[model samples]
Target: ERPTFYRQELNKTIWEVPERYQNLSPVGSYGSVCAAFDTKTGLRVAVKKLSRPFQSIIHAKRTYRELRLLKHMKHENVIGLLDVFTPARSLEEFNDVYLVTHLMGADLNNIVKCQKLTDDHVQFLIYQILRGLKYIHSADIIHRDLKPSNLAVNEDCELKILDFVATRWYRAPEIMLNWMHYNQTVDIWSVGCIMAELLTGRTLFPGTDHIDQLKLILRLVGTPGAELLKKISSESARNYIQSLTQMPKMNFANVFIGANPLAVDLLEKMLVLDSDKRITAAQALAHAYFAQYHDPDDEPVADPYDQSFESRDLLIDEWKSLTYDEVISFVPPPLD
Candidate 1:
């Protein structure tokens, strides 16, 4: 049987198996991604296939969240959602969802591990992350995951933040402590972790377990003071943190050897013990470290978080219905 292709009405491009250009290899956990050249539009694009999206409540919710948010989000530093489709015509038969996005050469994870990065390179790359974070946080969505691997970069050095799943080591301290009411500050902590890795070319907190992760963070940032511990709502978490011996802050100069002084200052602001004290994405962009690259008009407009939608404890069928609606309702614009 010939594989069915969905023709994009607005762009006049067909989504089908590639004959001339092969897709890029898959790297994400939930989907298989490939790259294809759209002959009609003369553009190369990446397509992600969400296999068994409705298999469980978790799978279905993640698919719905990524698709819905990506469609609505518009930012130069954030990944653009180009198009969406499904081969199955009926709701009962629908199972796969394909998301089309801009194609990139490699993820930051691969670059940080294998390639050498200079001060200018580090500054520009991190500036883009802050720009993207400013947009994401302004809208009240915490990326939850902001590791190097989740950032996609092209040959031109342009970067776009991608992926939403939280990784163990890159996760914030509150998340590791199992705090119930965390907010956008969680993303700041992840950015700090990623920045350190970019400068040193190694994981800042390579913990084998959650306990170890907390310990590693405390060692670098120093043990949270009494006032900071008061913010912890979990009784067990508070007690555990209190029980540990106090540790003095480590010198950033020694940690990120040969790093720029202004860069170290910004890093200190980002990796604070108190989430409230941690620098906001917008504020970080204005800091002296980025003075050479900052633009006054580049500041992102603040937007309130949408509290109208319910996301927790949703039934599998509810997720399936939500995902179905998102897949069908999204439409792409003209390729030109």
Candidate 2:
């Protein structure tokens, strides 16, 4: 028999329904997402039950990271964390955490695969994505995963970026090759992949595995030179990259052949092998490719990074404490 759960603070009931019965289809990989009907408030919301959040040290850390970011972020282009709660009343029994969010019509993945998107459709979608990334990166938070699947959209063509973990196909070269350190540029690379997919209606790098993912990137963008290869922290990774026969760069024009020239120019800058050479989200928004839709006066203002909270060296215990506090205190935004 299926059990029921409720959050007293928000006066919402959560029930487990089979995938087929759910009205709001699940979109993410991290948890069991279902459609939630709030009887007290008479509103429909999406609920996500995090899978075995405290199962391991790593799992707990990620749970905390997601919770922390959601609590602190305030952007229209990013998903709003409606509420978070635990069925357990006390710490000892707190093994599960549930998040309630505003329901979107569909993710960008479904739209990319199903709809025949016009050039106007592609341009507006990419602009929204860049605006989201601009807000995220400004706060020094890198969304390591930035695939089409993570982008949620509504009937109005509004887009909201979601998910925080790494995914191979959308992952940047620096991450796949095992760089000692990386930054927001990784997200920019994923944007380029998404843009290409939007334009051509196909994944730019549909690699079967991590190794193949790296090869696909190199094959299209060309192998890196000694200066770039020298930055590889792993000896094995460095040797392997060096051993491969050098490849010449492919023409972006041919790849995105019928696309707008300015769009192709921006894509080329984003897909560069070197992270340092990649464009920033802010710069991407300013590029001539987006001039048709972009308004200089309406650009999103950058949110300064709060060093105290953004510092990444926190202990696992610290993460747990912070996550617990944030989860219990979350409140839903007023419905439109």
Candidate 3:
């Protein structure tokens, strides 16, 4: 027998559908995306299809992580899984997943490009960023790719972080330095970069690539302390930094001349070169920069997200088999 989620296609990907999902159209997403009318909710929705998730071990694991995280993620500031299904009824035949969520017109990158954010917008926006990040950290998760582009915002100005993965311009010292241990602090450093972007309407560090990326970072953050430099795993990488000309750190107030003093103060804390020395997402929400928007009652946290699925190194077919079952067998949270 077949299944209720029958075979369908949109934007170069397959989908398993229900009758209420209608009038699908292309949305031009990074991955395959389709816009459709949800007659049940009488509103528009976006459907994201995974492309050949079974093709490779790394790709398969990333797929599972996204699916698992989306399944467990629940908060106003982060996009959570809505409805996911596939056409295949049999485990062996199941080859894809369709992720569906509410559709929005523009990411923050677009907004920041044309819109000059007032001081309030910058504070509230960064405040919401930490709010979502705190929950992400509470779930024991770290968002790798965090920039203006990754933030999805509605017209009302309410924003939610979109799918995972990351970028280079916002790379943290912990990452580029090749530190042995990496954690959610990496995300906070990016938040610092993003906050600076919002206030100044320019990329904080437009490093063309690794060579200059490190150059620009050192120029602004100043050279790493001897203790921090020792952590660089690559001998060549360490040699390059140790040989670079010593430069004093630049003042944030001079860099962002017109910005609020408190905003500048917060930026200084987040942009700390050392990840351990960087501010935590939870601690960031408590900053005086967000004092106006802070609501201890409103800011909430979540239970740790289970990531045990990634610990297994099953064969590709087994990855396909178990993932297929999860697409149909697992229960999702109620829409908030």
Candidate 4:
């Protein structure tokens, strides 16, 4: 049932939502987030506001992407869209969007930095990423960007992925080389980088820029063979790879010292430079490292999401209105 709408100023922006959302206090995003309580559910929720979502074509599109994807999905390890609202009563007034999601205490980046995680913590956490990722992939969507900072975790080590973007270090080789088409394996590479971070408490490939990132990756995974290198659409990008000192693969045991053998084994497979060679989320879930927690019945898949929504070429006004329509549609995984 739609609760009565109420209004309040949060982080200097006004938020209008169902009366059940209470105690707005800015937590921290595109615009800003306030830790609020969902009175009906009696639990905390994060109200993420997107400021000037219609300011530019890009901003509006990002806002649209978030709304479209979140609305169509459901999973335990993935953040859920509990509610969405706007203070704007008309399309012209719709400059801001408020997205309500589960409030996590700490992100994986901070957790790895401050807290000493035991093997069980790492295993369960990584398994959930694969578990959560498998569901996302089944929907035929690549989680293009997945890094430690975007992973939300609680004191109990429960993790839920956040953010629909990727950063440089977490970017895959294919994505960096300007390959014609990149697939879900881009996400696998991101997870591999995160696993290394979790293991060492430092970024596996903290490159300074685009070129540096490629160098850092090759140094560890070894230079790509001619076949993989040929896939790059850009001759310069390909030449740059060959320009490097042909590097030999580094031992995962050395890189991830003191880590489990199975963990290292899986990491080696995941960081493969070639997407075709990289392990799929499904295959990763079946690896020995996850043997302790893997359960087929517990893992679920999704119906392939219809992404035709993104193909539209509507101008800002129509996109703004379309986003408003999606939010109003508020009709509303897996970890061991």
Candidate 5:
């Protein structure tokens, strides 16, 4: 049976597009993506088609594993994985998976490109980004990849993080310097890059490849000293860092035209050259960025640092009973 949707004229709304979205066009793409009107229901939806299954067994397992994570947890900033629509697959050798999420608002990268966000606005965005991350970290899931292109905003000012490809672009020193299974802290490092971009109107690290990324990161954060390097237990990443020659000089204060002192400070904490010194998401919440804008006990603002790291570990043990996967559980099936 083919998937179907019913549509009829209903009440008019301010943001609603016309029954026909003739003006709709694609925003961006890395894999298979489409912008079209679901004429059956008068809905303007963006259809994201996943890349074809990889020939490598390891890559295939990792790809589907990410999808399954979406099913287990929930967050406002992370795109909600709705029903899967497969109108084209008919016992095909391999199939494409269509993720039907609410159309995301303007991506933060595009938003920053248009006009400079006020300091308060940037703080708000950063606060929300950190808050969302706090939630993910609390759940023991790390958004391994973080880039401006992946941070999206809705018309209502809500944020939706996407496409955590876990690339070297935003990976932590443990991964880059040692190739270790660094934890959720990797996402914090990405926040550092995105925060810099928000201020500078450009990418913080615009390297074309892995080595380029390493040089770019070093340029802004400087090289880790021997004492710092010796502290790392991750062999792969430690060796990589030891092998590097020149390190880049950092001057984040000058990145944004007039970046607020507090925001810059927060970014620096996350972008530490030594991964161990890198700020934890919970620790980030306590930084001046949030301290100025948030009340620790206020409703709707969940603070991840209310307890020490040791106590947090105890809570994670309890979470293991409920969460078996590294991320949320997602089950995409044929729609009714």
Candidate 6:
């Protein structure tokens, strides 16, 4: 039976299954996000489903906005929305939105928990993540929430970006203090945090409140200059900044013990305390980190943690090759 809210049949051309996946095992969960086999052919898949967040307009809007953004954006590294299932018409009937994405291996958050990452592995991750974000920003989408949890790898070990839950803590200072207009710059802020996580194997700012988050940033990057501070309109916010007597001492590479210097440089660009001068995805792509990526497929995957620095072809358009119809083609009928 078809789901009622589905206005039209999804175009099979947009998605199709490959013949070889039938033999693979069903995917299992590594953390908060769940995984399972696609019922039709038992192919692995990881899903982050959302129910009606009707508690407030903000919650509902966030869900709807993310859905719309995900549906329209397409890139190899960014999670693809193969199908969307929404139940019945009435709110009680079923307002759930199930997003089916290609199965990805354990997220970076979990990956770091088990294995110690080398500098090369760290650089590889930073480079791959920035490439993905470059694609996302090119599409004018800001992934407000980008952390270790949101970063994942596919069966092939390709880095994939997931999650859209941009929290108030990671919110760009402009958005938080109402200092600047909202834009993709917020995502750059997220990139900084993710980079920090890669270097330290922990979140950059684990602040419980806005002030806490603010203090954390000042400690790492030093207080924003006066020019950057002029953007703050809130009196309380200004008072909070003035209260800081000493600049917080932070060591980017020291945090990880043996982290790569290049990786640290890349992250510092995105994580600068001043949002006005924050590094952007485009600018980041041009950084020395990715400067040598003259070709995609030719690049080997030299796990940064190891010294290989192998370059692999990491392109945004390659993802379009995976189609939903291809996945369904293998759905074998039951024996009579």
Q: Worst lDDT window (10 residues) for model 3?
A: 1-10
TM-score of each: 0.88, 0.83, 0.92, 0.93, 0.69, 0.67
What is the per-residue lDDT of model 5 for residues 135-192, given as tens digits with 9 covering 90 to 100? 7777666677777777878776778777632356666655655444567777888888
Off by over 4 Å in 6: 1-34, 39-42, 47-49, 53-63, 86-96, 164-182, 246-258, 292-336
Error of 2 at 159 (Å): 0.5
* Tens digit per residue, CA lDDT, model 2, 1-336: 222543222223344332322244444445777666655355567878777776666777778877877776678788867667666666655667877777788888889889657788888999999988888888888888889879999889999988732378889988887776898899999999999988998888989988888889999999988778877778888888889878878999998889989889999999999898899999999998788877767666545645465446666666667677776677757655
Residue 267 in candidate 4 has what lDDT?
96
Off by over 4 Å in 4: 1-3, 90-93, 164-166, 333-336
By the TM-score metric, which is better: model 3 or model 5? Answer: 3
* Local distance difference test values of all predictions, in order: 0.80, 0.78, 0.80, 0.85, 0.61, 0.58
In Å, residue 158's CA in model 5 sits off its true spot by: 1.9
Q: Give the TM-score of candidate 6.
A: 0.67
Which candidate should be chosen as best, given lDDT against the real structure? 4
**What TM value does model 1 have?**
0.88
Tell me how far the alpha carbon of residue 212 in candidate 4 is from the true structure, in angstroms, after superposition: 1.6
Question: Between prediction 2 and prediction 5, which has the larger lDDT?
Answer: 2
Model 3 residue runs over 4 Å out of place are 1-16, 164-166, 230-235
Show how many residue pairs clash in every candidate, following the order shown. 2, 0, 1, 3, 12, 24
Local accuracy of candidate 1 as per-residue lDDT tens digits, 18-75: 2433444443447666667655466788877776788888888878878878886677
**Which scores better on TM-score, 1 or 5?**
1
Residue-level lDDT of model 4, residues 1-336, one tens digit each, is 446888776557777777778888877647788899988677788888787788888788878988888886788899878888876677777777888888988888788889656788889999999999999999998888899888998888888977732399899978877776899999999999998888877788998888899999989999988788776778787788888899998999998888889989999999998888999999999999999899989999987798886776778887788898887766751211
